[PDB]
A paper describes a structure:
[name] is a Golgi resident protein involved in the maintenance of the Golgi structure and regulation of intracellular trafficking between the endoplasmic reticulum and the Golgi. In this study, we present a structural, biochemical, and biological characterization of the complexes composed of human [name] and the 3A proteins of four representative enteroviruses. The crystal structures revealed the details of the [name]-3A interaction, the 3A-3A interaction causing the assembly of the [name]-3A heterotetramers, the interaction between the [name]-3A complex and the lipid bilayer, and the roles of these interactions in facilitation of enterovirus replication.
Of the six [name]: enterovirus 3A complexes, only [name]: 3A/EVD68 and [name]: 3A/RVB14 formed crystals that diffracted to a resolution suitable for subsequent structure determination (i.e. 2.3 Å and 2.9 Å, respectively). Analysis of the crystal structures of the [name]: 3A complexes revealed that the 3A proteins formed either one of the crystal-packing contacts (as in the case of EVD68 and PV1) or contacts with the second 3A molecule when two [name]: 3A complexes per asymmetric unit were present (as in the case of EVA71 and RVB14). This putative dimerization interface is formed by the two central alpha helices of the 3A proteins, which are bent 180° to form a helical hairpin. The dissociation constants of the [name]: enterovirus 3A complexes ranged approximately from 1 μM (EVD68 and RVB14) to 15 μM (EVA71). The overall structures of all solved [name]: 3A complexes are highly similar to each other.
Author numbering:
A (entry chain A): 366 to 436, 474 to 528
B (entry chain B): 15 to 54
Amino acid sequence: LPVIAAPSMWTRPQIKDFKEKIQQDADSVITVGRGEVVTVRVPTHEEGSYLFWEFATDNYDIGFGVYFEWTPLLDEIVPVYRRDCHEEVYAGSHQYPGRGVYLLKFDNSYSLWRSKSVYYRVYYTR
Amino acid sequence: PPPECINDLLKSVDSEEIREYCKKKKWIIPEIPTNIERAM
């Protein structure tokens, strides 16, 4: 079967620059309600190698994970876990296993009282 | 511009500057998501 390459993840200290840049270019800021899971679907491009993602939050942590949907099978790429992306920007990358759709899950399920503001950015290489 | 090397860069040195430059050279192409789903 297809062997799935391991994702890469890291962080960069400048949070304020990221959120500043996001608001400028477009308005895409996901507001995740209380007990909600937002899933951003990001398909693979016919000629493309990797998907790069970035995300950050304002006042609070949030759950993040990455799944891959084939061409409904699901591979788990980054298992869903809580990140402190309010302190720093969180980034990562993964190589295409094949033709399919990436599911970026922003998981607030645990939080009873608190909505989360999510700034995110996505890229791909060729 | 090999994909694997673009990754080692951004890991080690990451900023808006590197991102915009990598956008300039079309090493990284801005992505457009399709659907954004909401569940409880």
